[PDB]
Amino acid sequence: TSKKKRQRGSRTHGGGSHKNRRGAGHRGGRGDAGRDKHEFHNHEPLGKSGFKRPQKVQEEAATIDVREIDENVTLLAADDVAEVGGFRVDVRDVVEEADDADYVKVLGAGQVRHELTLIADDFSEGAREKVEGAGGSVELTDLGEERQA
Amino acid sequence: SKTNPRLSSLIADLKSAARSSGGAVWGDVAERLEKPRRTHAEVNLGRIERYAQEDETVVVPGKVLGSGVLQKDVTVAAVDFSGTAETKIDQVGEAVSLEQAIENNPEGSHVRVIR
Amino acid sequence: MQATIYDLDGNTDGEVDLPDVFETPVRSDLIGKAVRAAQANRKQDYGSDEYAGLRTPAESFGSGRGQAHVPKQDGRARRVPQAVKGRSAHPPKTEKDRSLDLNDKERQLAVRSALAATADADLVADRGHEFDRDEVPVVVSDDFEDLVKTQEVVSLLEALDVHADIDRADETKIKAGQGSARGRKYRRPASILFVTSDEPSTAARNLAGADVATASEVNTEDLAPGGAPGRLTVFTESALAEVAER
RNA sequence: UGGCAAGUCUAACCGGAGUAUCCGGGGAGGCACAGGGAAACCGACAUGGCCGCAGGGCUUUGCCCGAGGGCCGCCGUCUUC
RNA sequence: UCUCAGUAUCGGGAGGAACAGAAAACGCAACGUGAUGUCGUUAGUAACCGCGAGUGAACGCGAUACAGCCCAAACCGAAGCCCUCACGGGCAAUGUGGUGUCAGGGCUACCUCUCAUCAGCCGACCGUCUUCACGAAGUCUCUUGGAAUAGAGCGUGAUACAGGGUGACAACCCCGUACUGAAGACCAGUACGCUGUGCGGUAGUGCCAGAGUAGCGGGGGUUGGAUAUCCCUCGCGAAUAACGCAGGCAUCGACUGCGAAGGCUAAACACAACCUGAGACCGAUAGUGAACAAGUAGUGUGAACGAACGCUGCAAAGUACCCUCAGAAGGGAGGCGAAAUAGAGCAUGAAAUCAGUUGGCGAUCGAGCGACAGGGCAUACAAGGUCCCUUGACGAAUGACCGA
RNA sequence: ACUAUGCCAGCUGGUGGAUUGCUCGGCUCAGGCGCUGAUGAAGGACGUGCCAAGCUGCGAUAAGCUGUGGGGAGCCGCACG
Ligand SMILES: [Cl-]
Ligand SMILES: [Cl-]
Ligand SMILES: [Cl-]
Ligand SMILES: [Cl-]
Ligand SMILES: [K+]
Ligand SMILES: [K+]
Ligand SMILES: [Mg+2]
Ligand SMILES: [Mg+2]
Ligand SMILES: [Mg+2]
Ligand SMILES: [Mg+2]
Ligand SMILES: [Mg+2]
Ligand SMILES: [Mg+2]
Ligand SMILES: [Mg+2]
Ligand SMILES: [Mg+2]
Ligand SMILES: [Mg+2]
Ligand SMILES: [Mg+2]
Ligand SMILES: [Mg+2]
Ligand SMILES: [Mg+2]
Ligand SMILES: [Mg+2]
Ligand SMILES: [Mg+2]
Ligand code: NA
Ligand code: NA
Ligand code: NA
Ligand code: NA
Ligand code: NA
Ligand code: NA
Ligand code: NA
Ligand code: NA
Ligand code: NA
Ligand code: NA
Ligand code: NA
Ligand code: NA
Ligand code: NA
Ligand code: NA
Ligand code: NA
Ligand code: NA
């Protein structure tokens, strides 16, 4: 039995005095009315903040952390380039929605437990260090090298 | 409350085993399963890998999922496993149903609860 | 397990592997859900005329006549829901969404689960089907598809000990209530589902309570009318195999 | 409450058919998978330490392991001589 | 201001659909897309806004359906068109007609082709909608009943067990239903087919290519359009392809896209008059205002407003004859029918309430009308069967008399 | 044993038209289809029947005239005289 199903006989359906449940006065005015006066609590404060750049000059990076690559090397071995006790993977082939992005960037969250040779457009400093410290290497794509200028 | 007749059967069997063979784990798991689905365990492999030891059966009052890597050779008992989880676990170890766990071990000895 | 194939004389001729899906754990909750959804999804939108009771310039006199303030036209109350001829306050509405969504996986699971329930003779008898045999579902030679006359199917079913279900379904209930005014006067028990491969069986279709279906499109309602699992079914050998991958 | 799970769901629509049901396609796109910053731009703990409930262990009235939880530490970014 | 809202309402007008439509586009900036509409998404994103409340796209993508063309001018210059059977008339140098239309074209000189386009002729299948023809098998026995379409028994058809009718639950009594077949309408003067025409390439040539326009300013409206929407109004005002416009502030250069100020265009989408089908819709105070004479009766000078009313019975067998009466009334008697308490606004026939009557109370007595307990009087059966008294057993809390 | 005017509850018969059952009407969805008019439409007025007030049909050829096809032993609209 629902709450609603139990209202018949109650007369006020949980509304308290029958003088409640009238128009918008019972809610302090329609929609966000009062957000600066009687109802100000827990509204964001009024005002204007910052600026936006045009949607068409914004670049979108496709990102992946080394952890995701590394946790998956064996399954990607069934697909991408095992060589050298080592693995070579072109990151553009791994990342979902790569083509829909301006560039592919490898980030540094988690561990690298294998020797990896990584090809991407960009690398965090931490992703470079982890992949090297694991005895691997980082290969900047041509587009990646263009980004240097 | 519960609509899945198999979940109910599982729960009823977990209680019967706890009341007879004295396994308190099974009672503990029964009570958690009786709690709302929202509170049920969902555990990835990285968590099992971290806290499990061999010849101690991992018991998940919930479902095991497939993120992460499991090297350790362990028996994992759960309400259910994702397809990927069961596949990754069966390589290095054994994935098993709670109904089998109760059969092999009604006293619930040498188990570690993981969520 | 193994299924015993039967020929058009009703005699065992060979046998086949009962496909793995017939081992699907039976979920009556999931099956009920798939059936409720299919049943909802064929219901038609309806609602009262949006202007019913509103076509009137009836006005209230307000105070001073010793009368309640109620809109009147020519001395009769109008428009308000407490008035005779007034509008319906919260009527049925066409814009209401009367459909039920169902996840493909969840629906597909219920199909497999209902399939499996047809392999369990106790379940099938529980559902209420009348028949005498240990083995269910009934599997049959693909030549069943070449049958034409309904009576041929009768003889075959009699030979398979399964015809008593048709007898169960041969009676109609004249339903209590006003559905008869809408063309819903009658109903009858569901008897035998016939699953073929190439096209559904015109020979079997008019048997009392029978349904006909095909392995590729057979659904949860077919396997579990009213969401009750374990329908007495006959599969054609090819159907039995085709259903395996559903 | 139920399905599936590092994923998940398809929308319009297409084909089939028992033709509004239903079966098969369709992942366009949405949310989730990493955040911080107005922006430029940069980009994180698959666990270092302690306490300890449930549970488990042991030679048991006490030791041990202790998921979850709790307290730290550390890491990304903004502001920052 | 904003919002309600470019809504209500008003003026004008088309069609079976309308409008839009072959880039002076887009601008995931590209080595990319390629007429238009619509649907899904992009997204409550960008943008607007007493920066309050609110408002609110687009490109792209996935789909649906797909289709691309004609002038003006250059160069030709009467080679042309309309009416009429014909004669004949009219139009037309202020240009009819040929060419031509960014795949730029024309001209000159070549190379090559009969393909594109355009004008014509023929002219459907299938599908869909509706209508129609044909269409299997019991009207057997007993019982009940006014009537079997009920019960029991014995049979039958089914590519037909949808629905309806018939004196009561009907696959087999009748219409129909499955199957098969026929017609009309729409698709469509469409697709296919065909006739005619002829596509295209190179070099040369500043021959042609839409002006109050592009653009700027003043004042307004509108929009998400923000210095970057679309439009109106007043004023000003270019260039000529070696030129011009756009790419969300202005100017200059570069780069990329594109060619305004002439025109046409199938299909996919909207509605529901009309045909048909359907329903977890309502079921006569409901559902339309309207199951009935329904926009009827009736109200208002008018604009306009606007109800209520469904059911005898299987069959009218719808009550002959007689008595009464002022009587074609009504009554009595009688007749029909299973039933007339089915007798005409006639199935059923609640409550409020009225007549008569039964039980209880009652003309000396007090008012939330009762609840609970207990008396009296009243009560056919059924559907409830208990209850009284003496004695005895058990016997919680509580708990004596008398007597000493 | 009497008691009227009355009170309460039934019974018989009314009044009334609820209830139940019934559906020739609605409501809504869907598929198809879709223009008419100076060759005078749509709409309206008035006619038109043996007897004809209403509705329907029709138009001084007036519930109808003609042709072709269908249909069939009955018929003279709703409407049983
Ligand atoms: Cl920005
Ligand atoms: Cl986890
Ligand atoms: Cl270990
Ligand atoms: Cl594009
Ligand atoms: K599983
Ligand atoms: K047009
Ligand atoms: Mg409020
Ligand atoms: Mg995508
Ligand atoms: Mg409204
Ligand atoms: Mg109404
Ligand atoms: Mg009822
Ligand atoms: Mg304010
Ligand atoms: Mg607006
Ligand atoms: Mg755009
Ligand atoms: Mg020309
Ligand atoms: Mg405005
Ligand atoms: Mg009405
Ligand atoms: Mg007046
Ligand atoms: Mg009556
Ligand atoms: Mg007295
Ligand atoms: Na409340
Ligand atoms: Na109230
Ligand atoms: Na408010
Ligand atoms: Na304030
Ligand atoms: Na794209
Ligand atoms: Na009205
Ligand atoms: Na009053
Ligand atoms: Na709807
Ligand atoms: Na996707
Ligand atoms: Na404003
Ligand atoms: Na201006
Ligand atoms: Na542009
Ligand atoms: Na009525
Ligand atoms: Na009494
Ligand atoms: Na039409
Ligand atoms: Na008349």
PDB file of C-alpha atoms (C1' of nucleotides) in Angstrom, chain E residues 138 140-141 152-156 172:
ATOM      1  C1'   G E 138     -25.126 -32.042 -35.439  1.00  0.00           C
ATOM      2  C1'   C E 140     -29.142 -36.573 -32.868  1.00  0.00           C
ATOM      3  C1'   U E 141     -30.905 -39.249 -27.662  1.00  0.00           C
ATOM      4  C1'   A E 152     -25.866 -36.091 -19.085  1.00  0.00           C
ATOM      5  C1'   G E 153     -24.750 -39.238 -23.485  1.00  0.00           C
ATOM      6  C1'   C E 154     -23.172 -40.064 -28.670  1.00  0.00           C
ATOM      7  C1'   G E 155     -20.962 -37.746 -32.920  1.00  0.00           C
ATOM      8  C1'   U E 156     -18.409 -33.907 -36.639  1.00  0.00           C
ATOM      9  C1'   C E 172     -20.620 -27.754 -36.497  1.00  0.00           C
TER      10        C E 172
END
